[PDB]
Structures are given as structure tokens and as C-alpha cells.
Symmetry: none
Subunit: 25 residues, 2 copies
Amino acid sequence: FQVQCPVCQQMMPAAHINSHLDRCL
Amino acid sequence: EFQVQCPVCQQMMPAAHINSHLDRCL
Ligand code: NA
Ligand code: NA
Ligand SMILES: [Zn+2]
Ligand SMILES: [Zn+2]
């Protein structure tokens, strides 16, 4: 399922969002 | 044809699509 990152706006699998926010911020 | 595992979500998918599947920081 895809979610939008609340910061950079990229669409990505929900299972990545936490990890993404942790790495990019 | 080749499956590789996603290092973030541990799902299997074709190697051709793993690049698209992961997102980078902008
Ligand atoms: Na994406
Ligand atoms: Na961080
Ligand atoms: Zn982001
Ligand atoms: Zn994944």
C-alpha cells in the first residue's frame, strides 16, 4: 500500500515510511 | 526473473524493480 511522506512528498510503501523519516531527517 | 529481498520491509520482488521500490532522501 503506498503512503505519502509528510515531509518530502514522495510516495512509498507504508512499510518504509518510518525508516525513511528516520534516515532522511 | 531473480528475486531479491527488500532490506527495509523484507518483501521479495524482482531485482529489476528493487531500485524503484526503495526511495532516496531528497
Ligand atoms: Na516511491
Ligand atoms: Na535521523
Ligand atoms: Zn520523505
Ligand atoms: Zn521494501
